[PDB]
Structure 1
Amino acid sequence: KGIKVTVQLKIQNRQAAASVVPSASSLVITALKEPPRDRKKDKNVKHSGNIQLDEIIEIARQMRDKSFGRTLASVTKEILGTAQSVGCRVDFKN
């Protein structure tokens, strides 16, 4: 469910209990990267990977806390990979 401390979009008012995620930084990695993402990273560190394993990531900006409405997915694609130390995911800039 996430190794980094996952923030939630959760308010507690009179029986409101639902584990919902605001699509933070470290959970789109949990989805896009392989299921060995919440597991097999206790002592390992994996700074490897450059496969273009997806190209339709623009299906996430609607719940990715809209910031760049006039750009489709350049924020999602060309910014991640550098700070996202797991892989690169893009042979455009690295």
Structure 2
Amino acid sequence: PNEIKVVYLRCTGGEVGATSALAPKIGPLGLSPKKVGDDIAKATGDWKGLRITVKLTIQNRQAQIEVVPSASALIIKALKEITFDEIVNIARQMRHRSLARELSGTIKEILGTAQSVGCNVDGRHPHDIIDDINSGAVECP
């Protein structure tokens, strides 16, 4: 099983937290990490992102690789501190891009609309661009 299989996910981020973290409650899935495992997980997980920051943990006998899903919900809050146009295009490019696609424009609508509560390019709601998806609807491919 690749010598270890603890691939399950975790949903803490931003601050290290540690004591406030759920490491005591998720101990027995791998049984290896404990508090030292929690600390080494969050040392690489302090940044990227700044949110709940869902992570997927792949064990390394003692250490873990906390690969972050490029969750549009996570990354948008990671980017806002506003247009962020090319940044969100690039963020759409860096995810798995699948999202039940038909075209690049499909994921463009999906990820320019995912933040219907996080606003959008300067002074407009994240819907008008979605209707008029023409500016670089082929910019990713």
TM class, shorter-length:
0.5 to 0.7
Residue among 81, 88, 93 paired with 2:119: 88
- Structure with the greater alpha carbon radius of gyration: 2
Q: Deviations over 1:14-65 (max 9, x none)?
A: 244233311124421232101xxxxxxxxxxxxxxxx3x2111221234322
The count of residues paired between Structure 1 and Structure 2 equals 72
Which structure exhibits the higher relative contact order, with contacts defined as CA atoms closer than 8 Å and separated by 6 or more residues?
1
CA distance 1:15–1:69, change in 2 (3 Å): farther
Q: What amino acid maps onto 1:70 in structure 2?
A: L
Range with greater deviation from structure 2 (63-72 or 25-34)? 63-72
SS state at 2:85 partner: coil
CA distance 1:75–1:24, change in 2 (3 Å): same
Gaps of 5+ in 1: 35-50
Q: Deviations over 1:56-78 (max 9, x none)?
A: 1221234322223622422211x
If each structure's strand is expressed as a fraction of its own residues, which one has the higher value? 2
Alpha-carbon contact 2:55-2:67 (below 8 Å) kept: yes
Runs of at least 4 residues off by over 3 Å: none
Distance in 1 of aligned mates of 2:96 and 2:119: 23
Answer yes or no: is 1:70 the counterpart of 2:126.
no
Paired residue for 1:44?
none
Gaps of 5+ in 2: 1-13, 15-49, 129-141
Quote the sequence identity (%): 44
